[PDB]
Structures are given as C-alpha cells and as structure tokens.
Amino acid sequence: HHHHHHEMEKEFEQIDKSGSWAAIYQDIRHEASDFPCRVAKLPKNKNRNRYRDVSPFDHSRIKLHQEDNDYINASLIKMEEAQRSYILTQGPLPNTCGHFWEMVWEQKSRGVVMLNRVMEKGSLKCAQYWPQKEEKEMIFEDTNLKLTLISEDIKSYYTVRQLELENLTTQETREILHFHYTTWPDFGVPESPASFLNFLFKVRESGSLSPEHGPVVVHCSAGIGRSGTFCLADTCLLLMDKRKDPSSVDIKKVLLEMRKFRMGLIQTADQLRFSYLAVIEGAKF
Template sequence: MSEKATTTAAPTKDNTPARLKIEQEYNDKKTGSGWHRFYKELCEVCDREAKEQQFTTLESERSQNRGLNRYRDVNPYDHSRIILRRGNVDYINANLVKLERADRQYILTQGPLLDTVGHLWLMVWEQNSRAILMLNKLMEKKQVKCHLYWPDQLGPEHALNLRDVNLSVELICCENYQNFVRRWFKLTDLETKTSREVMQFHYTTWPDFGIPSSPDAFLKFLQQVRDSGALNKDVGPAVVHCSAGIGRSGTFCLVDCCLVLVDKYGECNVAKVLCKLRSYRLGLIQTPDQLDFSYQAIIEGIKKLNDPSFLEAEEPILSNDTEPHTQDEQPPPLPPRSHSLNLPLAPNTGGVLSLDMRAAHANGDGIVGESDIILSGGGGEKPTLSSKDALNNIIINQHEIVNAEVADSLLNNRPLPPLPTLPQHSEQESDSDDEDEDYDDNDDDEDDDDEEEYETIDEHKLDTANGDVTLLQPHEDDVNANSEKPTAAVEPHKVNGIDLTTSSGDELKRRKRTEYQANLEQKVNEIKRKQRENEDNQQAAKKRRSLLTYIAAGVVVGVIAAYAYTKLG
C-alpha cells in the first residue's frame, strides 16, 4: 500500500517540565474524591460557556432528521455541523472539531446506522478525508453499537455499492494487530469515475464507557495513525467515531491535541483544551475515567513518543483475516435452567431439536428461522449459528419467548404415547402396581390442597402459566443440546421418545404428572380470568360512582343557581 508509514520527527526540545506540571496537576486532583468533583466542575464550565455562546442544535431536532441520530441526547451543534452537498439529505450527525494552535482538525461523528452508511462515505469523499478512526466494536455489552459500513471481503465483486450517494467502496487490504485492525478501501465516485484510497484504523479493545487496556497500547495506535499521514494538514480532516462520537472519540482528540501542544510550545492546559474541543461538539469525554485515562496517556505520551526505542518498535501483524469484527464479543452464557421436570417429554427426532424461534434479528427483520440456530443433541456438539447478531439478541432479549414456544408446543401438540407391551408381571411388579394406586390416591388429595393454595396466588407468581419456562439441567429423558449421545451398542430402542424398558408403573406416573400439570395450568388460568373480571367490575363500579358524583354536583349547582336567580331577580 502507498505511504503506509512515514518517519516520525525527532524531538527538538526537552518536554520534561511540561510533563511534570501535568503530572502534578493530575496527582493533586486525584486526592480523595477530588477527581470526580474536578470532572463535574469542568463539565459545568463547558456547558456554561456553550450557553453563553448560544450554541443551538436545531437542525438535528427537525422531524426529518431525528431518525438519523443514533441517540436522542447526542446532537451536533449547528455552527460546526458537517453539511452534505450531494443527495437528498444534507444532514449527518457529525461536527468539525478544530484546535488551531495545534494545527489539528477532526470530524467527530456517531457510529453509522443502516440508513446513514451512504452519508458517512459521502462525507469522507466530500471532505477529502484520508482515514476513518473507529474506536468501538460493532457489538458491545450485547447491543449493536454500529452498523457494518464496509465490505468484509476482498475484491471488486464484494464491493459495497451505495446507489443513494453514487459511491462504491471496495476492500483492498486488511492487517490485524493486537489491539487494532487496519484496512484499506478504494472509494469510487460513480458519477466522475474517480477513485481515492481511504484507510480505516479500527481500535478493537476499547470498551464502551471504559478505557483502553493501557496507555502504551493506545499510544501505539496513535503513533500508527500519525505515521500514516491521516492527521496531516495537507489532507482532509480524519473522521473519528465510536458509538455516540463523544466519549472515546473525545478522548482520542484530547490526547492527540495536548501532545501536539506540548511538542510545539512546551506546555499545555488540558482543561482548557477540552473546553475548546467541546465548543465544537457537545459532551466530549463522557466519564471521569475517560478524563483520567486522558491525563495518563498525555503523561506517558510525552515520554514514549519522544523515545526512539518506543517509536522504532514495530507492531507485529497477527493476520490478514478480513472478518475480525465477527469475533468482537463472545455471546453470553445460556441462562440457568429451571422447571424442566415439569415439562412433558419431547419427541425424539434423532437427537436434534430445531426451534423456529421468533425473536428480534440484529438486522431488524424480526424473524430468526431454523437456519439461524440449531440445538444439537448428538456428540456433545455446541449450538450451530449462522448469524451472530441473531444469537446475541435472542439470548439477551428473547429467551423467554423461545422457552414459552417450546413449552407451548410440547404441552399442546404432543399426544400421549401408548403403553408399551411388557412381559408378564412378576410378584414384585404387582407390589409396584399397588404402590401406584396409593400414589394416585395421594395425588388426588394433593390436587385438592393445591387448588385451595392457588385460589390465593398472586399474579406476579404466574410466570409458568405466562410462558416464562426455561429448561432444567439434563434429565435422562430430556432432549439436551450438550448431552453426549449413547453408542449404538448400549442405546435402548425408543418409541416417541419413550424407553420401551420402562415399567408400566413409571409410565402411569408420567401420565399422572402430565395430567396434573395440565389441570394445574387450567386452574391458574381460571384464577387469572376471575381476577381480571373482578378488576373490570371494580373499575366499572368506580366509573359509575364518579358519574353519579358528577350528576349530583351538577344538580346541586343548578338548584343553587336557580335559587340565586329567583332571589336576585
């Protein structure tokens, strides 16, 4: 690739006094609870200056532009917002942030939405930006934070064609490092047939509302960005974004600007620099920890970015995989199992249970089919997934719906299997049958007790009846995705999921449990119906009382008015 790196300029002065001054300020503010108070006061000063300057965000609040904002409380200032010159929309949630003393300018923007991917690339083209600095992952804390806005495979046949803005984006190279990924794109204007190379620096280990693993890792990333020439004055401003475009993006800009000022002037007031940057985009630096890390990175950067051994140490390339974003975050563990012993047996389908789970898909289509997730019961295999976003969103938001569907299908659709034909009963089996009769009698008594108990049940305890059913730890008759499949030599023959070697007594018990559960669910539903009817009756009575009160008040007022009229008339 062209101009992958340039030589870092050698330091011309000793910046130790500036570093010691900033370090002293940092240590003074860190005593006690002073740091949080310092951050709060700094934010108040910046907000007060913004009000004095009468900065507005009217354009972002227009009805046609509200849907283009990722967050309702992160709006670009009108005086510094980027205006798109081509296409049907001129609005994008982005600001030009400048610090003239440092000869630095950036475009800070939000992580693109599905409908704003073309707007981002149009802004890159129109502003002549050389690089995009992405400081977040596509999915964080089990939530989608940024839409995938670049092609994830090499070659023109996989190019991203943006017809709404007449641009195409082709991935031409990818390098994976320990803490970031570097990509090269060919951005083509379909109107003029001209192309331009655009780089992307994707920092992959910076958590949302958090800080990088160490200042050194961040400084290596900053060095790579600087060496690429993406921040030079002779090119357009670099596009910097995270999810909202204010927290991590603001941290990057603050550290870079302060290090430039220390190199140029031998001093820097971090608080004033932050207030200046905040005058261009609202809310830069979201947390006290991000400000804390900014100070640490500035202090370390004054030393490390002037240290030849640090500058000359090359960051090793780990791979050229083009899809590291699919490994951004491992899916969360499955929820703990409960209540599975209350579920009837599932039919045996050869060790595989496929669920047609209707849950929120990450791309918004609202449907997750059998091809998206399959629970396998053979060989201890893990779930097979074809859509990572689907699995994440199912586990986060929809596992109750899935379990309800499983329970509902098992309760309503599966007929009871016939009793297996068994050899003649032995004397011991006859005793077992007698015990079953006693069990049946006890069951009837328990039914009566349970009916009285459920007459007073609270509505918030009806999770099982509402479909809040999750699966328990493996039962020997249950279909379990993680259980090992028995070998052919020892696997018993089953009909409809029932072991033929099971005694008739066990089968009767199983039937009794199933019937008991169905009756119990019917009783619970009846209780809920009566509660709803009672609430409706109470509400109707309340409305009648209110109406009678209003009528009586009207009559009294009318009588008083008539009496007053006759007396005064």
C-alpha cells in the same frame, strides 16, 4: 526537557493520589457550552440520529454537499493553536452509511478512526459500513459510491484496513486508511496507555492527520466519549510539541474549547484521567 516531564508526572500523581478527577470533570460538564441543534431535531432527521440526547450543534455540524437533505450527525472540531481539525460523528446507522462515505469523500478525508465495536451491550451500535473478506466490494445506494477492501491487518488491540473509495460517476478513486481500535468499551478506557499511543502514532505515521488531507473522521457509538478522549489526547500532545513550554497546556481549557464544537466530549472522569495519562506518556516520545 526533564523539568517539564517531572512537573507533568508529579501533577498527574497529585491529582490521582487525591482522586481529584471527579471534581475537575464535574466543572468541565457544569461549564460546557450549549448551542442550538435545530436541524438535528427536525422531524425528517429523526432516523438519522442514533440518540436523541446526542446532537451536533448547528454552527459546527457537517453539511452533505447534496441538495436533498444535507444533514448528518457529525460535527467539525477545529483547534486553531494545535492546527488540526477532526470530524466527530456517530456510528453510522444502517441508513446513514452512504451519508458517512459521502461526507468522507466531500471532506477529502484520508483516514477514518473507529473506537467502538459493531455490537455493544447486545445491540447494533454501528452498522458495518466497510466490506468483509467474503464480499470485499460494497456499493452505496443513492450516494453513488463504491468501497472495496484492499487489505486487513488484525492485531491484538486494533485492526488496520486499506480501503479504496470510488466516485462511480467520475471514476476517481481514493485510498482510505481505516483504523479500528477494537478493545475500548463504551463508557470505559482503552486497554492501556501504551496500546492507545501505539494506535494513535500509527494513525499519525499514516499521514491521515496532516493538513494535506481533509480532517480525519473519528467515531465511536455516539461520537463524544471515546471520540472525545482520542481527540483531546492528540490535540494536547500537539500543543505540547508546538509551545515553548509544554507544561502550560491546560487540559480542562482544551476540552472546554473542543466542547464548543460538539456536546459531551469525554464521558467519564476516568476517560479524562486516561487522556491526561496518555499525554504525559506520549510526551516522552
């Protein structure tokens, strides 16, 4: 009701006018939990990690069902109250695209939400693991998978793709919905709260976040800044819809909880502010 929104808006306005995002964000960083990442740091996993400073904790990492090397830089974020799980991963490296799709298949994901661009700051921050119009069919090496591009709808702030993923061995095929938000700079904010929400609701209406499917797979370059921003906003809007009093949602507490599953979620105070703004904006709907 109007009082809940009124409180939400005033609160946001109070924090904004006083420019208090920096400190809130600082307490979150200073209080974030730290768990071991032994597997991530194993020598054999060196070229499976894009950055040495971004690793998945052991307890929540995603394990490939293979026997050779079940390691991938992806973490399982599980939010009980909100009743949603998300997989947050780094942008695939040229040598981990098979793994990426293996994980999608094994986790039974229906959707993949991409928040970065392939080239950022002059270098490859994400190998193109999906097919292009010219060569609509990709075959992934020793992961025994086949991916084909069914449709592509390029819009102003994002692109939506229908992909068909096939297990070459069993011949089972599955529909994968790819949601590429193409205008979110690394360490920056989205185009606007409205393009972001429009994007998020688009992912929601697709049925990719429902418990009928494995967890949505979300990534950016490192899988913590933008990926964390996207997931914190979704989860908070979820809690706002599930609780008797939506105004009781504790953004800092919710982000700290998510941070138990993967380090660095939300990389700048402006990304924390944007996330908050996306929630009270989305709460209207």
